[PDB]
Amino acid sequence: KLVRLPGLIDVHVHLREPGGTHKEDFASGTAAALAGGITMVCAMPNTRPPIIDGPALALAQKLAEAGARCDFALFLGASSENAGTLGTVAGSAAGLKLYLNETLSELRLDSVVQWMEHFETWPSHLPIVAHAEQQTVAAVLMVAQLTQRSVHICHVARKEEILLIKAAKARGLPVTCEVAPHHLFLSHDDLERLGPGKGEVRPELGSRQDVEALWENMAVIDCFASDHAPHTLEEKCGSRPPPGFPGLETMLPLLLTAVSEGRLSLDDLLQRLHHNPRRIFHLPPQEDTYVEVDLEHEWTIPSHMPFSKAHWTPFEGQKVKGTVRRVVLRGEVAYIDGQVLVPPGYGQDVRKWPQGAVPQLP
Ligand SMILES: O=C1C[C@@H](C(=O)O)NC(=O)N1
Ligand SMILES: [Zn+2]
Ligand SMILES: [Zn+2]
Numbered sequence: 001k002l003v004r005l006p007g008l009i010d011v012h013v014h015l016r017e018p019g020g021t022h023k024e025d026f027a028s029g030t031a032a033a034l035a036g037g038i039t040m041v042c043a044m045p046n047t048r049p050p051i052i053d054g055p056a057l058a059l060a061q062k063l064a065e066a067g068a069r070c071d072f073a074l075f076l077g078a079s080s081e082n083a084g085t086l087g088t089v090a091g092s093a094a095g096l097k098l099y100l101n102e103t104l105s106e107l108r109l110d111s112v113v114q115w116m117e118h119f120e121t122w123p124s125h126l127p128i129v130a131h132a133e134q135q136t137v138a139a140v141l142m143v144a145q146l147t148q149r150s151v152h153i154c155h156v157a158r159k160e161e162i163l164l165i166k167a168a169k170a171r172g173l174p175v176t177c178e179v180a181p182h183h184l185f186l187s188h189d190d191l192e193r194l195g196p197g198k199g200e201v202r203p204e205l206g207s208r209q210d211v212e213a214l215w216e217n218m219a220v221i222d223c224f225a226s227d228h229a230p231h232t233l234e235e236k237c238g239s240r241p242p243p244g245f246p247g248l249e250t251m252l253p254l255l256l257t258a259v260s261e262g263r264l265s266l267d268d269l270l271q272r273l274h275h276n277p278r279r280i281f282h283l284p285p286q287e288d289t290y291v292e293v294d295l296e297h298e299w300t301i302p303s304h305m306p307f308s309k310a311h312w313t314p315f316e317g318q319k320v321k322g323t324v325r326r327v328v329l330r331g332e333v334a335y336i337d338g339q340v341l342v343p344p345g346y347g348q349d350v351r352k353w354p355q356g357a358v359p360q361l362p
């Protein structure tokens, strides 16, 4: 007996196109999404070239429309040069992404004043998300308060961070956050097995106490999101390993296993992979869209999942219970039992749908 879920949303994926298509492209990354029970993705802007201006966004929009197999929105990226220049295209993006710690030279901000400038100039009704670790979480919260608006904190990974966000929510501040599966299901205990190359990710893997704090404080977590960050094994195992794990194909099986064990409820899962992504990012419903999962099937995660071009996974060897059997996307069978059945280009930019525009005062 299968369970019907709504179309799940992953608000944090790196699909590498343009410029890193050996790691992933729209077609392969959205195949991975569908196989993971995800029907809508929000793609991050740290591509090559990065999505930091209108021409780059225009290119990325067309590449996605031609390659995506599920629906999508594209983030814009903040740079040291683009504050005050994005107003005409801002509403066409998923939101604005700030990279406040390590990142590409093009997305590096060297001063909190530049963060300020972005919070002041980006349209106040549109989402802002920040990669902000440890004290950077408190710093960007301060900037959000000074500019009187909300912020969403990406991939919270530490006890310190979730407790700071908890304290901010207790003071009524408009902050939301997401957590990625590797920060719920992997820890320092796994670094022996992974090694120092494969184990590289930002935010880094936490201690057992970090992991336990995130579970303890599930009420504080608004969204789950993969931070799908595909890199090839050659890159992960080489001399300058880039941070990041692939995660689209493993996220839902890992979380269904947790539901099975009573660690969170099905509703808790659906708030975090459907309702809260919708409401934080103003993402539209998808008509005639659903995912059928089998909650009894026990399997072991292999050395690589079928679809991501990353061709490896840090969850190799973990035993899971739960599998995606079928995905229907806008009335068409998109995935069944290991086969993706919609072509590249079936997916659409949800920000172009009438119901996908963010409401604003005239
Ligand atoms: O901040 C990031 C970005 C990402 C990537 O590879 O694009 N991977 C990470 O591990 N952290
Ligand atoms: Zn990040
Ligand atoms: Zn994020």
Ligand SMILES: [Zn+2]
Residues within 6 Å of the ligand: 012, 014, 044, 227, 229
């Ligand atoms: Zn990311």
